[model samples]
Target: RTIVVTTILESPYVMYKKNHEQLEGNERYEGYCVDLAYEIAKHVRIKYKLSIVGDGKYGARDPETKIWNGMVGELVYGRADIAVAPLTITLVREEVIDFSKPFMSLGISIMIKKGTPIESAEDLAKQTEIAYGTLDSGSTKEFFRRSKIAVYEKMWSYMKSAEPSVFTKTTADGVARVRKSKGKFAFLLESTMNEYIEQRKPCDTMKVGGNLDSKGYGVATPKGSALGTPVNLAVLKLSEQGILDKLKNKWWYDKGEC
Candidate 1:
């Protein structure tokens, strides 16, 4: 059986190749997850096809309707066999889907203009001169929403009521807002993406302070899927063999512009 894989179009994770129009199928894409997908399939000795998530969300549920969306939704609803993306493994998500041992470690990070005075989450929460926000409909946003930590709770209050509405639809939008805000806007995102952007050209942004919490991205399959065991084993083997580090360097630093 050919596995149906779902991913998202995020830079350095899964992105359309420059001349994708001329390419077909998986050849049209390239990134860390793209390479990892091939390796996982090869290691598992299975055939598979890759597809981007329809709604471009990592995954979340609507409180009103309680329907899951994004790659998790695809797997939960039996539309996809697996997902190979930078999908964060969270307690809520794990309740419905199976996540392999984390292939990459990351944490919530602060992204700011090069000269911004903010050094930590506490700094952002203690002052209002610098506005901050996160990507909407994503785990990062949910972190603030669900956090009981006093500083984070304060931040959530500010973000939810901030004038001009600080929430962004995408990571790119959040980064762009930080760059254009004249050091007035700070974007809270995953450390992986923040570090990747810091090395890119026109790199006017920097990741500051320690991460908020440790987390990881895992290959996800439907809960109780037969694919889960092999996938987890494959990830473990790849990590032990140092392939994961190699892939991270290839995608994040080898192409660094700054």
Candidate 2:
């Protein structure tokens, strides 16, 4: 059977090839997820088709209707049978869909302009000179919004309504905001991405402070679907064989454009 795979276009994890303009379908992409998807499909013995999330919200439940949106929505709403991306696994999401074993771990990290005065979430929360925010959509935003860890909750309070609004729609947008903020802004994102951007050009941005809290991304499937078991097994097998490490090195470090 063919698996309807839904994912997002997150860098290093999932991205279009440089010559994607001349390509079609799966050939249009190449990255960690593309590589992993190939391996998983081989193990599970299924032909898979890739589809990107159209809503671009990372996945969230509507307050009034409680309907899921984004990649998670595709699964619960029967639009996709499997989802493989940098989607974070959370309890609320777990209630609506199933996530396989976490293949990679990451944490919330601070992104700042070179010479910025802000050192941590606390530093940003107490002052107004520096503006800060998380991706407008994704676990990063939900973390700050719902965290009760005192400092995080306070930080969210400020970020929730900073004049001109601090939340950004994508990691690239957040990075650009920090870069153009003139030391007046900082962006919070996954440590993996934060570190990746540090090595990129303009290299003036730095990931600072320890990770806010450790977490990971998982291969997701619709709740109670048969794909979940084989997908999880495939991930565990690939991880045990060092395939995950190799892919990490291949996509994140091998190029080393910095």
Candidate 3:
């Protein structure tokens, strides 16, 4: 059977390569998830199409209708056979779909330029000088919007009413905002991405302090999809044989990740 793998555009996780625009089909993109899919195919012995999710947001439910949207929604609605990106696993999403054991773990962290004064979430929460925010439509945005912690609550209040909209459409936009802010703005994004950018050439951004909270990215599938079982097993096999480590190193390091 053919599997449909849905994902989003996230650096280190997924991205188009140099000259990728001229390529066709799956050859057009490459990254950790693409390599992971290759490993999955070897074990599961199936052909799959890698498709990006129509909605860019990491899936979240609309409270009024309790309907899932984004990648989770794609899987729940049977539009995708597998979701092979750095999609986080959450209880609310788990209620509607099945996730394989985590393939990668990460946490939210601060992204600041060389001279930004924003050192911590508290720094942003306590001062008005350094503006801070998240992507407009993803788990990061939802986190600050829904958090109960004092620092985050403080941040939410300030961000909710801040002028000129701090929320961004993508991680790249958030990074660009931080770079152009001249020490006046800070962007909160995934630690995985923060680290990858740090290692890249422009290397001006740095991840500071400890992560706010931790989570993992799992292989997502429709509820009780048979592929879930074999996919989970395949990941473990690769993890055990050190293939996972090799893939990560190649994309984010050995090949001079960008």
Candidate 4:
């Protein structure tokens, strides 16, 4: 049986070696996911191939065509046996794929230039001086797009009409825009990413606002795949043994800010 896994090139989670183009096979990519994949392989006693998803969107349903992207598509189409990236669990995604009990937990936050008057999502939603946006088709965008909550709904209204319409094709693009702009734009994204950026040199951007929502990152498998049971159990075991937290600190915290 062939086990193909799909992933992305997100830093801290997954990235290609600087010399990846010169290498072959799994060595082409390395990071926490690569390590986790090996750990899962060890427990399940199966060998698998890793396939990179060209698009970076974290799997969303097309309002018109009703399709998925990134790792989500990998499993939905049976192109891969598992997805081991920082893929978040959402109701819409769970409807199609099976997620292991969360391997990691995180919240959404706003990355703003230092000295920005706004202190929270509510502050941004209430004012118009600072422009805001999120990744074009990510969970952050979806959250604002779907939120009926008062603050987020108002914030979404502003985002939909803000000049230059701040959406970006990738998280790195959004972060770069926030860094270059004259403290006039704010980017909404995961806390982990926001915190990572906060520690970088010229650290002008800081994560403001409490989390918008809390969710889990899971090792996703195709529905009913035989590997799902063993993978889920392995994740649970790792969590209980405190190995998951250790891995997070190793890759996310201990690693100096980029």
Candidate 5:
């Protein structure tokens, strides 16, 4: 059976190639994860089909009903055989699904329009003139919601209470809000995404301040699935061989501008 690989569409991770309309199947897509997926699948010797997650979320459990959604749900429900995306590996997720060692490391980061005065989370937390928010229903949101630190906790309080609801439905939405806010809004997202945006054209945005916390993205599989062991080994092997580093440069720095 063909392994069903579920992933998310994010710039420099998974995106449609410019000539995608003239392409077919996986050939239509390209990026870091797409290349990583191909390399890993080759090592594991599995025939795979890459499919985008239906709801466009990385996966989070609903509070009241306890149902998992997004790419994580696809695995929990057996809808997908593996997940090869920028999904953060967290304690809660680890308990539900097995994850390989981190394929890449990152942290929660702040993105702002160029010329914005803010330099840190403390700055955003202490001020009111500029609104700040995170991508709704993802690990970054969960981080602030569960933080015990004074600054993050306080920022969460403001985000939850903001009248206009600063939370955005997608990373792109949060980034768009930052670009369009004209120095009035800042976006909290993964450092990898923030860095990728900083290198792109129309370079009106920048990642400021140090990352708030540290974590890594991992390939995931449902608990006890046979693929887990091999996938884990493959990640380690690829890391040692420097394949992961090669892919990162291929997608991120090689095509970078500004």
Candidate 6:
């Protein structure tokens, strides 16, 4: 029996191959998480299928029904056996789902068009000329919304009321907006994504500032899922043997980046 895994189409993390339709099974989608999922499946002795989440956004609570979306929703509703996207470990997510020991680490950073005056989050909060926002339903957006930091607190206020109300439906949209907006808009997103974007053409955007907070990317399973133990052990074993770091450098740094 094949386990169904829920993933998202986030560049450098999860993406459809140009020839995905011609590929079979897991080969249909390929990226950091896709590759990681295959490795975990190997350890668990199960075949798996990668299905993209219908909603592009990362998991977040719905203000209306208070339900989560993205992989969180899939797991909570039993729609998938595992989630192998770049899902961050968060306190709220931890309460409802089980995440494997972290396979990767990152922090939030800002991506701005060339010539933007902002040098850091500090600079971003103090500037008025450049507007900033995060992917509407992503971890970055939630971070600012819940932060006690003064700069983020003030910046959140401005973001909440900015004329256009800067929010992108996806991180890719936000990054593209920054590239084309000519310094008018900036995106606060994972440092990994920001780093990947910086290497691509037109090379118009740059990631600046130190990371805001530390976080890890982990594979997630539904709360109390039987699969949790094996998955966690697989990750820990890989970490101890240094295979996890090898995979990171293989996919994230060498293969994904142009």
List all candidate RMSDs to the true structure: 0.9, 1.2, 1.7, 1.6, 1.1, 1.8
Backbone N/Cα/C clashes per model: 0, 0, 0, 0, 0, 0
- Winner by lDDT between candidate 6 and candidate 3: 3
Best by lDDT: 1
Instruction: Estimate the overall C-alpha local distance difference test score of candidate 3.
Output: 0.85
What TM-score, over all chains together, does every model reach? 0.98, 0.96, 0.94, 0.94, 0.97, 0.93
Against the hidden true structure, what lDDT does model 4 obtain? 0.83
Estimate, for each residue in 1-258, the C-alpha lDDT of model 3 and write its tens digit: 777888988887888989997998899998888889988988999998889888786788887998878888898888888888888888778888998898888999998898776667777787887888887767788888889888898888998998989888888888888888787888888888888888887777888878999999898888878888898999889989999888878877886634
TM-score of 1: 0.98
Off by over 4 Å in 3: none
Error of 5 at 147 (Å): 1.5
Q: How do the residues 1-258 of candidate 1 rate in per-residue lDDT, one tens digit apiece?
A: 888999999998888899999999999999999999999999899888899888888888998999999888999999999999989999899899999999999999999999988888888999898888888898898899999999999999999998998899899999999888899899999999999999998979999999999999999989888989999999999999999999999998999999
- Kindly report which residue stretches of model 2 are placed more than 4 angstroms away from their true locations once superposed: none
Ranking by TM-score: 1, 5, 2, 4, 3, 6
Q: Report how far off residue 91 is in candidate 1 (Å).
A: 1.1
Residue-level lDDT tens digits of model 6 in 202-242: 76888888899999999899988899999999988878988
Q: Which 10 residues in a row give candidate 1 its minimum summed lDDT?
A: 52-61
Report the candidate with higher TM-score, 1 versus 2.
Answer: 1
Residue-level lDDT of model 5, residues 111-155, one tens digit each, is 999999999998889989999888888888888889999998899
How much lDDT does candidate 1 score?
A: 0.92
Residue pairs in collision within model 2:
none
Q: Which lDDT values do the candidates have, in the order given?
A: 0.92, 0.87, 0.85, 0.83, 0.91, 0.84
Error of 3 at 154 (Å): 1.1
lDDT per residue for candidate 4 within 1-258, as digits (tens), equals 758888888887788889999999998888888888888888888888888887765787777887777779878998878888888888888899999998888999888888778888777777777788988877888888888889888888888887786788888899888888888888889998887777777767888768878898899988887888899999988889888777777776686664
* Residue 27 local lDDT, model 5: 94
